[PDB]
Amino acid sequence: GRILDISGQPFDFDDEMQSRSDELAMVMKRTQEHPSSGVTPNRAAQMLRDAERGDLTAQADLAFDMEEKDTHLFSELSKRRLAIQALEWRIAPARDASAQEKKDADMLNEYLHDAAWFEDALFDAGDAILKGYSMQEIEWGWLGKMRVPVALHHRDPALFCANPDNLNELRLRDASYHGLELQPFGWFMHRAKSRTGYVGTNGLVRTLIWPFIFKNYSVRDFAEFLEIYGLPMRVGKYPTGSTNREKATLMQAVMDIGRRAGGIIPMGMTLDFQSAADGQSDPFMAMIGWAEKAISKAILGGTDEVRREIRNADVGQLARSINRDLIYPLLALNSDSTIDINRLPGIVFDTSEAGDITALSDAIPKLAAGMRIPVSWIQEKLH
Amino acid sequence: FSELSKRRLAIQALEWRIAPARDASAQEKKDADMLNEYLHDAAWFEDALFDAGDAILKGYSMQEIEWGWLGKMRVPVALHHRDPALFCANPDNLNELRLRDASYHGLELQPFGWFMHRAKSRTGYVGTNGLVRTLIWPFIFKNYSVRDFAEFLEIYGLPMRVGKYPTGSTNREKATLMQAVMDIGRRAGGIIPMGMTLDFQSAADGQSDPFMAMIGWAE
Amino acid sequence: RVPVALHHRDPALFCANPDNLNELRLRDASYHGLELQPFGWFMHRAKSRTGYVGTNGLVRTLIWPFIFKNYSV
Amino acid sequence: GRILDISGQPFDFDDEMQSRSDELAMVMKRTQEHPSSGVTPNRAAQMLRDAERGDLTAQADLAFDMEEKDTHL
Amino acid sequence: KAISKAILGGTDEVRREIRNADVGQLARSINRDLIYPLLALNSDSTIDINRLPGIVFDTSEAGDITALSDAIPKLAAGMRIPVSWIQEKLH
């Protein structure tokens, strides 16, 4: 009953979800700050430094606002995140697998391909690309004679503050200096480190906050410029001493100028037209284009080999996280004997580049004569 | 960052193997294969390779080794990437990284407990060979140009709206004039006495060509 | 016993529960709101962006370019 | 007769449509707000935040107006 | 351009990925709420929740008939290619 985790520390496993503990009811329900309203680079630096020190709430809210506000950023982020979901995967057994190990690996493979909550797990784990860390709870359930998850809820990333000590262990916030640690076997954590460093640093929001600010400020300034451009101000200079009644009619006239407007004014009055916005759209669009290009560079790598390498890298990191926290827990809970930590099934994504069928088909039969070429190596390409 | 990640992910893409020593005997080949399989089946090696790429820009990637007992093999169980600022080069011989201990010489590294990867792109000492030495100048130029360009767009294309009230105007007629001159928006149109003026003076004149030229050169 | 017609009710009639923020509940002028009758509500939550039920719509991202384009036009 | 749902909670299934329950007759018939008339970014942010908090009505009406108004969209 | 980027992904692989993703989400929703209800209502025994029919969309990319036709007979000699796999492309 005293199940050991991956690190070999015995503990007692509890079916109750850590959030639903009747003690964190008033700290798991937070109304979002929306800090991206009127951001100044000084304040963005301040929230980034607060996140670096350990308080990740402001950074997570800022990342969420950046995801939903900047349309180009969202398009690029979705383009990157859907690359991962497209890859086909299988639970390849441990190397030199025996009978039972291969059978258990195949059982896990079939169950995961026939579980509706795995695709949600993979889609939500892609949130760590921008915020830095995707944390999902595991609501354990009884499926026949197998203790397997029945739902993976994606908790808000702002609820987790890094420990002030060792700065790499995500701890659920409990209004404490150290913070409440994660309940074992009940928190699917995927830390996607694009940049080496600590848990708060490795998010792409650190790099993308500046182009986001520049692009959005330029866009708003450009829109306000178009609000005024191409329509000159219409000022009338009534002679001094005019009665208080003749100013009202003059103002109602000068505000009545429309299409083909034409009227009469006394010799003492003037109706000069002064421009209220002079310039062109070249600077605003230049800044917008540069910022969008920078955002695309940060997200994908270039505005096709680089995108493939990005996909392979972050897919490998996700696979390592899954092996840590979605295969070993199932094996340990379902089985009763001490699970061999050295040899356990691991998820593998089919990230191999597709093989051009025509070149292989007109090349292999030519090399085959003379060379023993395994059918399998060839069977890997397509079927 | 995009270029640095593009370079660092090239290394991780390469496949590797623990090739035995040349003219390997039986036992040497078997040990080499054992190491190969163990390292391909250890989760902390990929982290080691990803963190060792930090030396590209800073100059030196230092990772501690938390030794652990795996059956009957004393092998690492976790490689923590310590902050590079904690290490100061020895004032003597200037090539041995020593953990800082508030001392002149500094505490040396504990043996068999510090994975050090000194990526020398340029010949020289440990502090020199980082790419930050070369890249600090284009970084400064590009970022200063970018901030200046953004501040220029903050002001460009919206002329300053100054009103010249005749002197001797009551202290109440200056407030209304200022609230009017700050009420100019889309299709704004109003009346001013003959003695007042509403000249529009530009507050930022120029174009985006120089800023973008400098940004392109720096990139 | 199979469906004979699927009526598309107006999405404004549904308010997310103030608790757990992911269960769509038919609005009944109540704080919690009337829950959906089982086996009688075909619900398809298309999450383009990770988050809650109200967040994952594309209107959140597209409201700004829509405003800018239409004001400019 | 006590059919269980996907989540294994027994219940009684009813053929009557939930809307046609003689209690939600005055809340299933709403005349649309059309909030996209004279939208200011402040007000768009306000309705987005209201939708985030749970009241999805304004967001849905805004999305409908965006769908029928912006031709490219 | 921004609206097109948000909707499709680019103003042709990206559109295919978008279609596959949202079609998969729709298929999961249908399996949750348009197959199990029919099975539970029509049948009287306890429906096996673990094993129930699921809707699948034919999202596989079309196969160029000329390349397959002049490649497979060249590989077939020597390798046991299954007619089925080939039958998936078109008929």
Residue numbers in the entry:
A (entry chain B): 2 to 304, 322 to 401
B (entry chain A): 75 to 293
C (entry chain C): 148 to 220
D (entry chain C): 2 to 74
E (entry chain C): 294 to 304, 322 to 401
Copy the relevant paper text.
However, in both extended and contracted states, the head and the connector complex remain unchanged. The Mu portal is constituted of 12 copies of the protein gp29.
It has the capacity to infect a range of intestinal bacteria and has extensive applications in genetic engineering research.
